[model samples]
Target: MASAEVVSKLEAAFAKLQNASDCHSLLKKYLTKEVFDQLKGKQTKMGATLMDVIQSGVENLDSGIGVYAPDAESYTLFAALLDPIIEDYHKGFKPSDKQPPKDSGDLNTFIDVDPDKKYVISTRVRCGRSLEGYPFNPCLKKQQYEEMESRVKGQLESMSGELRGKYYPLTGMTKETQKQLIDDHFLFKEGDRFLQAAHACKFWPTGRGIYHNDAKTFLVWVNEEDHLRIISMQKGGNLKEVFGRLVTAVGVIEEKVKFSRDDRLGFLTFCPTNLGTTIRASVHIKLPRKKLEEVAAKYNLQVRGVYDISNKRRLGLSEYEAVKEMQDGILELIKAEES
Candidate 1:
């Protein structure tokens, strides 16, 4: 059973959710009385409790999904609360549904969606991977973060050819270089309220670093939200090339390191939404309307004339399909923009 303190905290969060009108987090909607009673008593092997998983949602009422897996095991232990939210957010993924197996799909079938370079500003495809042995951020030790950083840096340094790059630790990085990276949208900043609330931002710059190839089209983020955020990107809309590079990079890293995965979940991640394929294929395109908005919405893409368009669903799909979703969605948006 949950300790009195845990129960009492749950009660207070529930009370707030009941009374508050502005917050629309999934945690608020899914943490029903029955679900609350069922999960409040459980704790994962890492000693993470229901509170650890929902604390972010409870503390920050303005969350989208609200809950995060404090450790991989929290997914199973707190399924009662997470399943409904997953189904709702992933749009038709169900409790019984198993995420499709790994398939990076063929790149040749795709051509540049914006071949003329008239619309797309850039293209990027990225995926999160968790190292097999480590716990999620909330359960991580300070030492573990530094250790993971060293291990990842070693692997990145071994790359040859187009993938070869230098590792720049967030620690000791000059302010000028940091500013340049941030301006290019190549750096991730600290002080994210959601990640901070979930304890992911602890240990600060101790293990955090960024690696990008000489061409800057490929990069890896070590010790960020995930153990590694492998990325492939470039200007224009050659998603095919961007995705191909990502697949090759992930393959190379997978050969060197074992990633946490589950038969049903595909790839394990700190965030439930990233559990399966973990692929986010996107483009920054300027559409600079209502019908154009409707076209983008038809594909379930994010809004704006110059929108950040990406695959809406990650779990319950193949990596190939995930990229294809972005490809097809952008194709439609471009067609609508021209017509």
Candidate 2:
């Protein structure tokens, strides 16, 4: 029998979803009480049980139906638990449609770097990719995690020239070193409660790592929200250079691991919001709060930081299309700041 706290957490997680109809026959299969009974008592590979995710996910409403299975057996056993939640998030996503052809639009760099420090500070564009063979965070084992790290680390180590950089395994990274990366926006923070409850932080720092090229212009987060998060960033708003580097690195990384995709959903990610292009291109600028929101709303982007402008859409537009839109927006913001 599970502890009362565990049971309460499960109840809370379950309460987040409702069928809005009779709690009879159909409701049973879509998160049946039986599945919970079986999984609640079982422990995961990382010593976390189904109850952990239930508690973690319930604590954050943004998690959208928080849950993850710790193994193939666990997933199969709890398919009803996660499947319905996935469907709830990705309504109308069926398996039949053909995945669209990806386009990078002309090989040449188009946007010029903005040298004006009057507004924009730095530009960053990142896209998440999950490997074809690996399970999304919830079910990965210590060995499987290590294997993935090994596979990607090898490819990243072989990179040369502008993309050449060393991989820093988080297992032994110094606190100062980690802080520098996070402050510079070159790395991610430790897993949050939402991600932890979703089973994304199993094994803690075990198989996690980061790779940055010599110039820090190109970087890949090894095992974070997804199997890989390739990032391209640089000081000053150089959308063209940043996006160009990201595209090249993505193409190279694709050779090593085939990312999972859905015909209707595009690139599959752990988060439902990242379903389409999986690209999040952003820039740090110095626009005032009011002007920043105005420009952000006008350009179809989201304003987070004092002036961090990031794209809002994940579907429809390709990576190049989104980045180009951001490039134009940054120029507009710079225009406003100067004049």
Candidate 3:
């Protein structure tokens, strides 16, 4: 449950989203343009503060959980707020005319691993589509357009050898069997497959294209030689360094994402402390469960699934509120159960 003060702030923010004369202007005012600029430099305390605020705003309106609903009023407002930043991010990409190749070679040997060493396995983490809808844009298309987009995405999937072996294949097994094989063998297997798949996968509207605002998908290809390098399918900052910056930034902000109880509306709302009071932080860390469990015990925290934690820092909330909610939620479960 959330506090009354938090609820009031969230409702006010939502109202502003609903009533703003110009969505972009509202976003610029609240989301803060400087945060976008901060993406270039090393992750400073100020940069992290800016990101926390931006994330909090986006997470507050996230309808993935029933905690929030499909409120068109809120969606329109939030989308407007995010559009410019997202668009700007997209513009940074240098569009390529090269379509995904028709045939990816050696589907059978898609993933390479050391057979002698027993590799510790991880689960296949599904990537979420951007707010604008990856591979498909709902705003621009009707039913037919959506269907077409789905087919296009599916075709692109076929072109990627990783996808063909994992999800859909022409030979050697049924779709179900192939899927099962992927689940058992390749999905999140401890090797470069996961990263390779992410890299090889084609992003729709490829090459210097901006989809929704400035939101872009990034991949980190850290190898022995490079140590850490961030790669974006679309042109953007080095994601590895950006990720480090993000982690440091979040630490500096110390803001938490939370759910608020709105007594007047008999519903739960969200808010953050900084820019527009929204914080959305997601992390994918691959670590040993036993080691994590040891750390959790030291911190008096419970562990859940694999080396991943999804935490949100709500706008206009205290750090205690945010941290407590995280400890009690799915993040803890993942930390404990997952390898």
Candidate 4:
């Protein structure tokens, strides 16, 4: 039997979701009575409960996908509730579907989608990788966070040439520099309420750090929402070079710091949306909303815009396919814009 406190919280959350007609979170949609009963009694090895998974959704009803994996094992422990949500979010990724192995795909195959700089403003591709031995944010200890930061810092510092950069710990970073980084979108946003509810924000600024190469085109965020957020970006639509930089940086970091991954799910991270390829290939562009929505829906991309157009299929696809989809979709969007 689950604890009384846990059971009550689950009930209250379920009731709240049922009563609110406007809330359309995945948690509200998929956490049916049967699914709730199946998952309520289970807890992750780290003691994360059903409450930990759904609290964010309950608190913030506007969430698109309400549940979060408190730890890697939560995905398995609460599969009854999570599986449907994952399937829904990843589009057609069903329960029996196994995400294929990681493939970076070929850089040579990609051509610049916006060579004239008519539509594309910039390009960015990023992926999240959780460290092998650590649990996700909610269950992480203060010391563990610090250790993770140091370990990542060392690995990032070892990079030579294009990937070379400095690690700036958030604890003592100057206000001006912090503002600059945030404004530039080079640093992760702070005080995210969703993360706070998930218990992922306990030790703020203790282990948080950001690294970027001197050119500021390549960057890595340590101890943020995920263990590591490896990124490659640049102005204009030279996605091949931007993605190539990300691949190289991820490869170098992976050589030293082992990332948690599952055979069936691919790379394991804090969020299920990033379970498989974990790669989000995106470009900042200017486009009419109607045309953008039409093209985006056709290709399964998310516009958060210049419109932040990115691939929606993180699971059930290769890193290459994710990027290709984004590029192809953007090309269509450009063609529509021209029409």
| Best-matching candidate per lDDT | 4
Clashing residue pair totals per candidate (backbone < 3 A): 4, 0, 48, 1
Which of the numbered candidates is closest to the native, going by highest TM-score? 1
Between 2 and 3, whose lDDT is larger?
2
Per-residue CA lDDT of candidate 4, range 34-118, in tens? 8888887777777888888898888899888978887877777888888888888888898889878788788988878998888
**Would you estimate the TM-scores of all the predictions?**
0.92, 0.74, 0.24, 0.91
Runs of candidate 2 exceeding 4 Å displacement = 1-56, 59-99, 107-109, 113-117, 174-189, 288-291, 336-339
**Candidate 3 structure, TM-score to reference:** 0.24
What Cα-based lDDT does every candidate model obtain? Answer: 0.84, 0.69, 0.27, 0.86
Where in model 1 is the C-alpha error above 4 Å? 1-22
- For 1-339, candidate 3 gives per-residue lDDT tens digits of 224454455445545545644444323343433433322122222111222223223333322111111121232233333334333332321222111221212223212121222221321111111111211111112342334334433333332221221122222335674475355332121223222222211222221111110122322211111111122221221223333332332222122211222211111111101111122222333334255555554433333433444333332232233233333343344444444
What's the true lDDT of residue 98 in model 2? 28
Predict model 4's lDDT versus the native. Answer: 0.86
Better of 2 and 4 by TM-score: 4
Residue 97: error of model 2 in Å? 9.2
Task: Please list the Cα RMSD from the true structure of every candidate, rounded to 1 decimal place.
Answer: 2.1, 6.4, 19.5, 2.4
